[PDB]
Symmetry: C3
Subunit: 209 residues, 3 copies
Amino acid sequence: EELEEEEERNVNLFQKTSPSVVYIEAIELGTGSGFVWDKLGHIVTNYHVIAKLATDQFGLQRCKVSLVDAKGTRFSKEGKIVGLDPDNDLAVLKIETEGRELNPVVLGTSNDLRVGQSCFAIGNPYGYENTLTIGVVSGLGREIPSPNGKSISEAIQTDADINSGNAGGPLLDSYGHTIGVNTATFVNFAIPIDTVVRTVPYLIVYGTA
Amino acid sequence: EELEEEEERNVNLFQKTSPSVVYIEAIELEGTGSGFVWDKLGHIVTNYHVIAKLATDQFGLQRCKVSLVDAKGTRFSKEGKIVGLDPDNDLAVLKIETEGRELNPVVLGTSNDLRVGQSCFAIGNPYGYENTLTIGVVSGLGREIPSPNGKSISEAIQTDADINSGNAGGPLLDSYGHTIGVNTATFVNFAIPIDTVVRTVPYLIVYGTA
Amino acid sequence: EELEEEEERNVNLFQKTSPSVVYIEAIELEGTGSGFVWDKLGHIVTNYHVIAKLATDQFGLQRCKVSLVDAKGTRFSKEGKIVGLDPDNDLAVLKIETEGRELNPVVLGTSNDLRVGQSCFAIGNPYGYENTLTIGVVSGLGREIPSPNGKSISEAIQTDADINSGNAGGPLLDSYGHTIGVNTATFVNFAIPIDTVVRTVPYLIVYGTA
Ligand SMILES: [Ca+2]
Ligand SMILES: [Ca+2]
Ligand SMILES: [Ca+2]
Ligand SMILES: [Ca+2]
Ligand SMILES: [Ca+2]
């Protein structure tokens, strides 16, 4: 492109990662983002994003997930809760792929981050297009033994604008790897990808951390 | 300069484009805003909201002062007269008398070939004194809205360059220094795509409406 | 590193300048702020607003704790005493007892040759634990104000690097790691230009006032 090198990396990073980002609507008969964990149809998001569906339930609460498959085709499916972890603000959902091929994130690591490197936050703000915000890693939080709801252990602080429009979506590094999960239930913060890598396999298999 | 390459680009872009930026004061005999020079005749583009009371209320008192800079670098000010309005797309055109002054028109770019991730530069004139620069990326390219009506932009450019009152109505630029949109604030920040402006402004000038 | 050149400069700038940054707690026997190490003797520069109650209220209980890091990397804390105040330019100087600790003073730069569009880096210590980094550009270079008086900065540096309570009183830096300003928040973000601090701080130290 006739774009600068940095613009080129940004543009490419978005083209290759936004197909992993999903849009989540909490309907009552609350909106958020999430991302594709695997080809089976597991979706990671924030607990706050699906808080009513998981607690109120009451029978009426449903969960619609919109995304894109490997061909580029927008589509939508009912999302079922597989596991919750409100302590780390994590939740896993499962959709039925039904032969659709998904685009899983590429997991990175959060223990070797350095304050000053680029970070990229992607969300799906209104159900239509995905959105990109860019900043740096501003801070690497301290270890919090019992996080309890409103406190992230090892939180990644960033100055990439993070709001409701992209909470639950991935925080990426300059290689396009996912190093965190955007939150907003609480100057912006992500849950480190290392906490998610330790926890998500237990939510899938046991249904709790 | 001993500045990094990126700083150098930013510094030059601002030097070569800020002279196109104007400051707009809605006086009652309140509300301030930015706009930019469209051509050497003295046409100025801004937001409709920026000149809303002057255009709707009128009443008699409402005047319109425009401050800017000529090609020599000399600051100066003039009365601004409404030429056309397009509240649907949040656009307005004003006319000032140059009287032998040479202005610095923007360089129009295009907005249908933008890509999420490229750089954008928002320039305004926030308090009547110096121009201001904010830098971000194109965060989103909005969907088509056939009948925008007031508080909705068709093909809105979303950016994370900080956009406020201090620079509404001023230009959003790309890395070549071309204008690709118009900063709005009436509605996470949004610009009206320069393509909508390129189709609409010639009609505001010639007919006085879209 | 496998980091891009720009990330590399950012990462290094932070590593080499965050040890100069200090955390300031106004304890009543509240209000927190940042500041930075001016010299090896133990002088600390910050905002006046940050230590306002300790300087005006006093009463008796008001104390001032300062946390920082020595040249070996060891975190440590000390009582901080007011040396001089300058509320007109929102400046204050504090002194601590090093008692054989080696400190890390900022490297002073200049603010008169700044250009809108160059990079700037704001650093603070927001909750007493780690230091934070925010990155932007110089957005504006303010006009001269002969009598600033409280809520108005002469030659203010405007930036779009995020500036809040968590880093007020801390340094604003350029791409070389030099300090070009002091973050404020008592008043779109603003820093007090380092040139005003370079003229004023020697008087606060020696005479106790500007
Ligand atoms: Ca290129
Ligand atoms: Ca950059
Ligand atoms: Ca911001
Ligand atoms: Ca250079
Ligand atoms: Ca490298």
